[PDB]
Amino acid sequence: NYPAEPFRIKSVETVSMIPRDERLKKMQEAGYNTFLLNSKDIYIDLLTDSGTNAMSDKQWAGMMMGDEAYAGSENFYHLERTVQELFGFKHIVPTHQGRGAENLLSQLAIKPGQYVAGNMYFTTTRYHQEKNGAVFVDIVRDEAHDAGLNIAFKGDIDLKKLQKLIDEKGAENIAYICLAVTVNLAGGQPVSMANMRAVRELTAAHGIKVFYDATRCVENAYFIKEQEQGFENKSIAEIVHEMFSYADGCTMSGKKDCLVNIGGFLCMNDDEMFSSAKELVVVYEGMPSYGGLAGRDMEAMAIGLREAMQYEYIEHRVKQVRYLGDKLKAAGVPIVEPVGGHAVFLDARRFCEHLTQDEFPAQSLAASIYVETGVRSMERGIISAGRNNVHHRPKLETVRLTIPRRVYTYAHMDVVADGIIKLYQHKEDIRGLKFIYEPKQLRFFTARFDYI
Amino acid sequence: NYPAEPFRIKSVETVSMIPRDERLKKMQEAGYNTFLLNSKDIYIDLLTDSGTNAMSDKQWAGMMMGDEAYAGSENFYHLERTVQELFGFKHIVPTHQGRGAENLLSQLAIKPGQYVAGNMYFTTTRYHQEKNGAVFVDIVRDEAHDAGLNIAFKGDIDLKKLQKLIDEKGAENIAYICLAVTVNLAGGQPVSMANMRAVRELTAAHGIKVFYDATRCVENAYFIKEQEQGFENKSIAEIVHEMFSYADGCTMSGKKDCLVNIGGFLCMNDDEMFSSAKELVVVYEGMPSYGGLAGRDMEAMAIGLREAMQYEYIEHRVKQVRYLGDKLKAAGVPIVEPVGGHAVFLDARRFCEHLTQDEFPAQSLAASIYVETGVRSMERGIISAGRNNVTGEHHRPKLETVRLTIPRRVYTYAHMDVVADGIIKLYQHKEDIRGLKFIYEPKQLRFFTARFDYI
Amino acid sequence: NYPAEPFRIKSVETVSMIPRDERLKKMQEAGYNTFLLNSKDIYIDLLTDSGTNAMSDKQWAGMMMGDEAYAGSENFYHLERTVQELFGFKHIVPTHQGRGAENLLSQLAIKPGQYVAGNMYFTTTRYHQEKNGAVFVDIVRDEAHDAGLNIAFKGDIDLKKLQKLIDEKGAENIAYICLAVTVNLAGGQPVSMANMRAVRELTAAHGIKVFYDATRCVENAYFIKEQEQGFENKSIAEIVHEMFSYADGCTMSGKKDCLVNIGGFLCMNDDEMFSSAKELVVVYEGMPSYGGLAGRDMEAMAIGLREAMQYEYIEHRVKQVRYLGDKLKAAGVPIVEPVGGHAVFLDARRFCEHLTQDEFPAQSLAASIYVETGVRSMERGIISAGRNNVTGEHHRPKLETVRLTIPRRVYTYAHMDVVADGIIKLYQHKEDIRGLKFIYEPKQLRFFTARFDYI
Amino acid sequence: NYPAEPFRIKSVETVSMIPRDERLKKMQEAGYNTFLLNSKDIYIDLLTDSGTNAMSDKQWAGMMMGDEAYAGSENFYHLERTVQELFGFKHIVPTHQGRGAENLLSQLAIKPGQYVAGNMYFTTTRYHQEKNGAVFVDIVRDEAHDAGLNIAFKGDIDLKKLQKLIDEKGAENIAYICLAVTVNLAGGQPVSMANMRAVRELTAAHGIKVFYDATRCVENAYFIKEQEQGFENKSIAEIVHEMFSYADGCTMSGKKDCLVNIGGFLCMNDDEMFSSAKELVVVYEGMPSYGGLAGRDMEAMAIGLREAMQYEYIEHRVKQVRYLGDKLKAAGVPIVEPVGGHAVFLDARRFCEHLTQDEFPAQSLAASIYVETGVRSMERGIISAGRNNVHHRPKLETVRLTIPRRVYTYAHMDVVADGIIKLYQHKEDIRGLKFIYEPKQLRFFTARFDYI
Ligand SMILES: CC1=C(O)/C(=C\N=C(/Cc2ccccc2)C(=O)O)C(COP(=O)(O)O)=CN1
Ligand SMILES: CC1=C(O)/C(=C\N=C(/Cc2ccccc2)C(=O)O)C(COP(=O)(O)O)=CN1
Ligand SMILES: Cc1ncc(COP(=O)(O)O)c(/C=N/[C@@H](Cc2ccccc2)C(=O)O)c1O
Ligand SMILES: Cc1ncc(COP(=O)(O)O)c(/C=N/[C@@H](Cc2ccccc2)C(=O)O)c1O
Ligand SMILES: [K+]
Ligand SMILES: [K+]
Ligand SMILES: [K+]
Ligand SMILES: [K+]
């Protein structure tokens, strides 16, 4: 039901084990904002799965083989051929991480006033689209916004919505479709191959380009192998390769499914766009031959992307997340369903119905969770959705327990679940928050609170 | 209760995950001898807790700071200060691992014909004692030889036996007392502080030296903290320091409780013996300032011994082993009791009570465990006992066991479940396990390269 | 005098050692464009001193201690304290390297139509200034444009030009002064402390901000210690701290003087600009607590910046480059003078005075150097200048040079001899060097992938 | 004439650069014994080439791939096949370093009262021979004991002496011939292939076994390629393999020519001796499958032994030593000739003729050299030769400047030479030593002196 880790522990990261009374003072020193906690005071850090992964012995051997040459590095060639083989795109440009690739794509592929349509959006991706003049259009199925609705492949694009956008706006005014795998904001929900194929067919008939946000494509491939009829006999690598065969290019944060702590890249099949991409990468990232990465990190990412294709690794990755979700759900703790590939999302408005929204139940729930167990989590609701000129009220008001790859055990998942549940058994005791410091911008990062 | 890992995974070691049918072929190519399996074919390797530990990020940082100088390495001085602080001995000599320290001690402290008495024995330790002319005497409590008896501090020396030896042989004819912590041969059983003090008191009244085999002294310290009344407010480091205050020196395999993959050392308080040890170490190991270790490894061992003093680390280490024993015992699987600090020992005589010992039930059980789970375990039964080469008969040990030896910080509870679930499943059909026979038996060291086939 | 390396080799990087005939084939397969050679085919790679440095054992120990947390990493706090101590700025934001910091600064500090004035320019720096609407003005001393003039502190800003700009355009229309240390385009020439103070004094009287391009500020500090009277009793760290006391902030490529393979940062004293920078860094680089770097790299950069303050290290760094220039100059080989902190620039116009600039003498000289020695160098001449795409004509730079760029702590004087001996041998038969012509020219970034063949 | 380093610097070992006045106090704190100096106070440490080498990036990648299994390690199999391929012996037993292999060989191959004959001897090797009851006989050519005599292949065995030993003692009373390559005590002097072939032919005709001390066999192979007629077209690896084809087994300290910081092994062709070796290694070293080494060190040594076969590496290794020797000899500094593979040996009785032997000119010369430059060196004369029951007066009274592999540059060699020469230009100023502390045993290690 829940497989054991398909690897051994090679080396350990020492943690402190400071007790509850001391954690309380550390939380109070952070003004009750988990973003202000220091890493040295954290037992289990579930802020994000981005860049927090444990590398393997083979990756660390590659780390000693960094060819740091400015051009012509063996590490660059290894990453290049690995991505060409596993993803099937003609051209690759490394970037220091995913939002560097998004910066390049959005400048290369958007004319001001055009539309970018996607299955929901991610913060940085949509910023770079809009900064370059695009209008974002959400074409995900309506169900993906219903947090409790347990349906498969919730990340799928609604073809009816895409058709409507083409009819109302015209194909020439659509810069591209942005298809993300998995869909982070919906809870890490996967996209079916049938949907990628149908989106490809409809866009190609109109000459519209498709670019993937590939950041968790291996988790997505696992959901396809597990749940999409006809893929039970296909390897993860076969599934990944077919996925990208329905795309014109992709942006990738290697910090996610390539099992590294830094790294990303931009892929594309078009030669002229590749030429333009090489001119632009020099401005922001570095020469096309390293893209703002040390040689040893191009090497680690090449090795990690291939490790991620191992069935047992990605099965265990996803089922470990699922174990945390299953234990919370069996206790009645309200969560986004179905559990996604990389995180369990608490529904904090359901958790703290005794507190009003304006008392910040997600922030105070995250604070309570650290004090009782030593775990940090992130905000994924109104605050992240931004404010609107004419707030950006989201249906998904979530607190994220984000699982780094290969870092934690099921016993760590139990510490997390036991603490969230023991809190949930006295849920009414948790206390609302009020600001005592709020900056104008990026407030989730440095704002400070106190109890009402 | 079983605590969560008081650490995170910093990096992982790749494993193959081959399925049962392919494990059966690897087991057959190994002649059904788990000692012959390739490491790359093993998912969970419980052959030994020696030298198989996972180091920390701080140790690996130390590995980048190896001062490889032949004499005067900063890493030696760090190892020296650390052992002087944590164990309290005056002098320390590094050795490449534990049996190199034993070689030195036995040459330094034994005159031929003298007796060495200990709480049971370990093979390398006793060999070096006997090779240098000592006669071994077991002075452990009789309870330690009852593998089913669930009692605390089973490793304790019987003071009456030690008193008896002093009276019959004479104090001047006893080279030293060899007190091991924990006691490996009894299943990893701890020694109480009460016992260490009484032994120190009795030997000191007669001028007799006491040297500890300190290889799992931190596991031992945890049992004292957990179970000896009056130690509940003492830190692991306090307990360790007090333990060694009752010895004249020690031999240590860092490969066990110092959380490293190689390394050991010899400690002593006597200045004259220290001079002689420095003269001998150059013969077998290296200079007194590196003792057959790279500078980076003295550094890793210095850091790891200090890491081992963290209460939550050693609590979890010992309770992870206990989890494995508890789950087996709850399904009725026969094991040595109580569970020791580092391993669970299956009682293969009872597990395979349809087989005779001449059909090698421990060897066969270990083969079955690997086939069913990808877990390697060690035969510790008639095969490892060897054959009497005077008579040609097997040595027939009372203990016919399979050792599930747990490396420190390498595995999780889910790995422990893989081990337990597969053993419990084997146990539910234990009568189906077949006997083995030799098809190749070397003259010596037969457990290492012997090959078998099913009867 | 040329000091010995004030370090030992801890580990080496394997190289192939292919002979001349096989180097000729690799050069031909690269289309005679050294930017196209494979790193594995190069013995001594002098393409750039950026990101190619050798780290120390202490830095590699830091690499094992990467706290990879998304926010609040211990490595960030270490980098923060270190830069606050050594540079003296109030606020620091990591960026993945120097041009990421430049992107942020130019967006934060420039209103469209304003002027940015500097001591010459660097390509990425000036691009981000112009992309955000600034007009660039060169206020370096006229001497810096005379490549043969052997004078000290050639990088100094002409205070009269800065005064002239303030009077003609108005102080409110100057976004900031961009003072680079050293000045790359003049050959790596240093700026005097006297000049930094005078610039600070003049700009402060008008409310004008000053930001340093601090990429080789430690090389710059060494020239001040060596050649500016009154600094002979000052430590490198004292000089560095005083330099930055005359700026409102800086952009830094750690890939140069912080002795790392990746990393950079943005510094400033202004609280309001710091808030805005924290809002912008999330757009392009990452959180203010990692800025597009792994935790291990913030750690390595923190350790390396502090290592760079050691006098003997930077003395040897700069004198190793000087050794290369001196040996070339003594054989009559034409170079930019005086030699800068990080590179020797061959004057390929004069070296190949039998070729026209349209025959690409720098590109060809660099191809010849690799064939004869296995040394890679960078074309910094008409090819890198690019083609005017409005008119189709080459951009024709006054400087037609080959850059021998020296990575820090990677090479020895014997490697410098390989470079010099081969160049001197080429020079003794310089008339034999052939012109090149395009056989493939990309529309943009032509120095990176253009291919050539001999005329 | 002197090639540049055939590698780049990947990482540096930080040193202090403390000046002369501070070095003087550190030397005085060491009682004027370089063995008592702390490594952190040393710029250039030339005490020994044993275990002090710089590893490569590929070796450090292998260090991250340590398979620490007690039996069946991939690292063991790699070392095993590498040694079988490069040395050609049937069986290999790892040991933690060379004297662990000597302990095994001497117990396996010596009956009490038998003779072991060799081309000179080394300290640990001869101790293990004699401890197991053998009588040592030196059968090196007489010239090898003449330090100033510049002749090629000074390490060669005198076949006339070997013949005499067989005739006087009888073949059955000779346990084995111990042939070392190079010969350390003679100054690192090489042995010719012609001599290894002739020793093999004579011993085999009498049934006498030959075991090599292989510790610097790659340096030896370089001397053969450079100087022995007919080997100029042979690769280093071809030469090494032919060398060991004239032996029944060998002891190897990997700490020397295998380019590692720890490690060694015992090789042999005989099956019964291998079986006996496996039983004995368990007592002293570890199981035959790791022999007292971590897996990662078996890996590093397998990689390093193959790196040592690169012609340009070993040419530069030897010529760097030769450069130091040439610069001293051009200044009139008296040295052992010809310069050997691993060290330059000062002749300190010729250097300090104004001081008597009993004033310890070698010790005080080593002290002076550290104070003026930051360099440590070792004693190789009477003190190392031991005392005799009925001193062991040696013709070779040498101070060794021992060069670790891949650690230092020619500029470091110049610091060393310039300091020894500037001393030699005022040689008469150096001051004799007297004991202020002398232990009974191992006195070179901890004894303390003062100036007369
Ligand atoms: C689907 C998807 C992502 O999840 C993604 C990064 N995720 C992140 C990191 C992050 C970014 C912004 C605010 C908070 C946290 C996550 O914590 O979820 C990026 C950017 O990649 P980058 O971080 O490598 O620039 C692109 N697409
Ligand atoms: C020819 C030869 C060697 O040189 C050798 C080691 N040399 C050493 C190390 C050493 C040993 C004893 C006293 C002083 C220094 C050297 O400094 O010269 C060994 C022992 O190997 P080991 O050190 O690996 O045990 C065997 N044969
Ligand atoms: C109580 C005690 N005292 C001394 C030592 C020696 O230390 P060292 O020389 O190994 O460092 C050991 C180590 N025991 C290992 C390794 C082993 C040894 C022989 C056969 C199989 C396995 C095991 O129990 O597996 C020990 O447990
Ligand atoms: C004075 C000065 N200011 C800023 C930067 C940017 O720093 P960063 O973004 O590289 O970290 C640099 C780095 N210069 C490199 C790299 C390079 C860049 C373009 C073409 C070729 C090579 C070179 O001189 O080789 C610099 O020298
Ligand atoms: K990270
Ligand atoms: K090991
Ligand atoms: K780099
Ligand atoms: K060493």
A207, A391, A241: which is closest to A309 by C-alpha?
A241
Q: Tokens 């080439």 label which residue?
A: D49
A329 is catalytic: no
Segments forming the whole domain that contains residue D171: 57-309
DSSP result, C249-279: EEEEEHHHHT--SS-EEEEES-HHHHHHHHH
DSSP SS3 for C60: helix
Q: Which two tokens stand for residue C91?
A: 């606020």
Q: Indicate the Cα dihedral angle A68, A74, A77, A81, nearest 10°.
A: -130
Q: Which two tokens stand for residue C377?
A: 């160098």
Please tell me the distance from the alpha carbon of residue B275 to that of residue B295, in angstroms, as a whole number. Answer: 22
Q: Alpha-carbon torsion A173, A176, A178, A179, what sign?
A: positive
Going by the DSSP 8-state scheme, the letter that residue B275 receives in this structure is: H
Please tell me the distance from the alpha carbon of residue B182 to that of residue B192, in angstroms, as a whole number. Answer: 10
C5 interaction partners in chain D (CB closer than 8 Å) = 409, 411-412
Residue D95: other Cβ atoms inside 10 A = 30
DSSP result, D261-304: SS-EEEEES-HHHHHHHHHHHHHHT--TTTTT--HHHHHHHHHH
Count the alpha carbons within 13 Å of B220 in the hemisphere toward its beta carbon: 34
Strands in B115-118's sheet, in edge-to-edge order, are: B91-95, B264-268, B249-253, B209-213, B174-180, B115-118, B135-138
- The nearest CA of chain C is from the CA of A119 a distance in Å of 21
DSSP SS3 for D1: coil
Fill in the amino acid letter for B286: G
Under a CB-based contact definition with an 8 Å cutoff, are residues C67 and C75 in contact? yes
Under a CB-based contact definition with an 8 Å cutoff, are residues C40 and C49 in contact? no
CATH at B130 = 3.40.640.10
Residue D429: other Cβ atoms inside 10 A = 9
Under a CB-based contact definition with an 8 Å cutoff, are residues C262 and C97 in contact? yes
C52 lines ligand 4 (CB under 6 A): no
Phi, psi of A376 (to 5 degrees): -100, 145
Chains that touch D (3 or more CB pairs under 8 A): A, B, C
Fill in the amino acid letter for A220: N
Q: Which two tokens stand for residue D257?
A: 């020519």
B452 is catalytic: no
Ligand of minimum distance to the alpha carbon of A342:
1
Please tell me the distance from the alpha carbon of residue A64 to that of residue A56, in angstroms, as a whole number. Answer: 13
A238, A218, A217: which is closest to A315 by C-alpha?
A218
Under a CB-based contact definition with an 8 Å cutoff, are residues C115 and C168 in contact? no
Please tell me the distance from the alpha carbon of residue A415 to that of residue A342, in angstroms, as a whole number. Answer: 18
Residue C393: other Cβ atoms inside 10 A = 9
Q: How far from each other are the two terminal CA atoms of chain D, in whole angstroms? A: 43
Please tell me the distance from the alpha carbon of residue D98 to that of residue D125, in angstroms, as a whole number. Answer: 9
Q: Which two tokens stand for residue B99?
A: 């049996």
Q: Is B64 part of the contact surface with chain C (CB cutoff 8 Å)? A: yes
Fill in the amino acid letter for B15: V
A70 is catalytic: yes
Fill in the amino acid letter for C217: C
Q: How far from each other are the two terminal CA atoms of chain A, in whole angstroms? A: 43
C325, C446, C442, C322: which is closest to C379 by C-alpha?
C446
Q: Which two tokens stand for residue A393?
A: 């009220």
Chains that touch A (3 or more CB pairs under 8 A): B, C, D
B66 interaction partners in chain C (CB closer than 8 Å) = 57
Fill in the amino acid letter for A68: E
Residues 6+ apart with CB under 8 A from C247: C89, C179, C196, C200, C210, C211, C212
Residues 6+ apart with CB under 8 A from A223: A152, A153, A182, A190, A318, A341
Please tell me the distance from the alpha carbon of residue A17 to that of residue B362, in angstroms, as a whole number. Answer: 40
Experimental method reported for this structure: X-ray
DSSP result, C147-165: TT---S-TT-B-HHHHHHH
Please tell me the distance from the alpha carbon of residue C243 to that of residue C246, in angstroms, as a whole number. Answer: 6
Question: What is the β-pairing status of strands D210-213 and D174-180?
Answer: parallel
Under a CB-based contact definition with an 8 Å cutoff, are residues C452 and C33 in contact? yes
Burial class of residue B451 in the structure, from the number of CB atoms within 10 Å of its CB (0-12 exposed, 13-18 middle, 19+ buried): middle
Q: Which two tokens stand for residue B60?
A: 């690996």
D412 interaction partners in chain C (CB closer than 8 Å) = 4-5, 8
Please tell me the distance from the alpha carbon of residue B60 to that of residue C61, in angstroms, as a whole number. Answer: 7
Please tell me the distance from the alpha carbon of residue C415 to that of residue C45, in angstroms, as a whole number. Answer: 10
Question: What is the β-pairing status of strands A44-45 and B91-95?
Answer: unpaired
Longest pairwise C-alpha distance within chain A: 63
User: Given an 8 Å threshold on Cβ–Cβ distance, is D13 in contact with C60?
Assistant: no
Q: Tokens 């309506």 label which residue?
A: A142
C351, C423, C419, C340: which is closest to C150 by C-alpha?
C340
C380 lines ligand 4 (CB under 6 A): no
Question: What is the β-pairing status of strands C249-253 and C55-56?
Answer: unpaired
Under a CB-based contact definition with an 8 Å cutoff, are residues B195 and B150 in contact? no
What is the distance, to the nearest Å, from the Cα of residue C309 to the centroid of all Cα atoms in its chain? 18
Q: Is A445 part of the contact surface with chain B (CB cutoff 8 Å)? A: no
D4, D345, D287: which is closest to D145 by C-alpha?
D345
D161, D311, D143, D150: which is closest to D224 by C-alpha?
D311
Q: Tokens 């104090």 label which residue?
A: B171
Please tell me the distance from the alpha carbon of residue B112 to that of residue B130, in angstroms, as a whole number. Answer: 9
DSSP result, C308-356: HT-HHHHHHHHHHHHHHHHHHHHTT--B-SS--SSEEEEEHHHHTTTS-
Going by the DSSP 8-state scheme, the letter that residue C292 receives in this structure is: T
DSSP result, B322-391: HHHHHHHHHTT--B-SS--SSEEEEEHHHHTTTS-GGG-HHHHHHHHHHHHHSEE-EEESHHHH-B-TTT
Residues 6+ apart with CB under 8 A from A358: none
Bond preceding residue B338 cis, omega within 30 of 0: yes
Q: Alpha-carbon torsion D339, D341, D344, D348, what sign?
A: negative
Under a CB-based contact definition with an 8 Å cutoff, are residues D120 and D180 in contact? yes
Residues 6+ apart with CB under 8 A from B340: B182, B186, B187, B188, B189, B190, B219, B321
Phi, psi of B205 (to 5 degrees): -60, -20
DSSP result, C407-430: -TTS--HHHHHHHHHHHHHHHHTG
Please tell me the distance from the alpha carbon of residue D213 to that of residue D66, in angstroms, as a whole number. Answer: 28
Q: Indicate the Cα dihedral angle C93, C97, C99, C102, nearest 10°.
A: 20
Q: Alpha-carbon torsion D10, D11, D15, D17, what sign?
A: positive
Q: Which residues line the pocket of ligand 2, CB cutoff 6 A?
A: D 48, 50, 97-99, 122-125, 180, 184, 213, 215, 253, 255, 264
Q: CA–CA distance from D73 to each of A132, B448, C80, D397 (Å)?
A: 56, 14, 44, 45
Bond preceding residue A338 cis, omega within 30 of 0: yes
Q: Could you identify the atom of ligand 3 that is nearest to the CA of residue B255?
A: 11
Q: Could you identify the atom of ligand 2 that is nearest to the CA of residue D402?
A: 17
Nearest-CA residue for ligand 2 atom 17 is D48
A121 lines ligand 1 (CB under 6 A): no
Q: Which two tokens stand for residue D411?
A: 């500029």
Residues 6+ apart with CB under 8 A from D389: none
Please tell me the distance from the alpha carbon of residue D291 to that of residue C228, in angstroms, as a whole number. Answer: 61
C125 lines ligand 4 (CB under 6 A): yes
Please tell me the distance from the alpha carbon of residue B227 to that of residue B192, in angstroms, as a whole number. Answer: 9
Report the 3 state secondary structure along chain A. CCCCCCEEEEEEEECCCCCHHHHHHHHHHCCCCHHHCCHHHCCEECCCCCCCCCEEHHHHHHHCCCCCCCCCCHHHHHHHHHHHHHHCCCEEEEECCHHHHHHHHHHHHCCCCCEEEECCCCHHHHHHHHHCCCEEEECECHHHHCCCCCCCCCCCECHHHHHHHHHHHCHHHEEEEEEECCECCCCCECCCHHHHHHHHHHHHHCCCCEEEECCCHHHHHHHHHHHCCCCCCCCHHHHHHHHHCCCCEEEEECCCCCCCCCCEEEEECCHHHHHHHHHHHHHHCCCCCCCCCCHHHHHHHHHHHHHCCCHHHHHHHHHHHHHHHHHHHHCCCCECCCCCCCEEEEEHHHHCCCCCHHHCHHHHHHHHHHHHHCEECEEECHHHHCCCCCCCCCCCCEEEEECCCCCCCHHHHHHHHHHHHHHHHCHHHCCCEEEEECCCCCHHHHCEEEEC
The set of long-range contacts for C346-349, using a CB threshold of 8 Å and a minimum separation of 24, is C346/C377, C346/C401, C346/C402, C346/C403, C346/C404, C346/C423, C347/C147, C347/C400, C347/C401, C348/C381, C348/C400, C348/C401, C348/C402, C349/C400
Under a CB-based contact definition with an 8 Å cutoff, are residues B335 and B328 in contact? yes
A216, A234, A217: which is closest to A225 by C-alpha?
A234
- The nearest CA of chain D is from the CA of A216 a distance in Å of 28
Q: Alpha-carbon torsion C264, C268, C271, C275, what sign?
A: negative
Q: Is A279 part of the contact surface with chain C (CB cutoff 8 Å)? A: yes
Please tell me the distance from the alpha carbon of residue A267 to that of residue D90, in angstroms, as a whole number. Answer: 52
Phi, psi of A236 (to 5 degrees): -55, -45
Under a CB-based contact definition with an 8 Å cutoff, are residues A69 and C39 in contact? yes
Residues 6+ apart with CB under 8 A from D278: B444, B445, B448, D93, D288
* E-state strands within C182-222: 209-213
CA-based nearest residue in chain D for residue A58: D65
Please tell me the distance from the alpha carbon of residue D230 to that of residue D145, in angstroms, as a whole number. Answer: 28
Q: Tokens 């600090």 label which residue?
A: B341
Residues 6+ apart with CB under 8 A from D387: none
Fill in the amino acid letter for D194: A
Under a CB-based contact definition with an 8 Å cutoff, are residues B91 and B269 in contact? yes
Q: Which two tokens stand for residue D189?
A: 């002097």
Fill in the amino acid letter for D21: D
Residues 6+ apart with CB under 8 A from B418: A4, B43, B44, B373, B374, B375
Q: Could you identify the atom of ligand 4 that is nearest to the CA of residue C97?
A: 11
Please tell me the distance from the alpha carbon of residue A115 to that of residue B285, in angstroms, as a whole number. Answer: 74
Phi, psi of C349 (to 5 degrees): -55, -50
Element housing B24 (H / E): helix B20-29
User: Given an 8 Å threshold on Cβ–Cβ distance, is B412 in contact with A4?
Assistant: yes
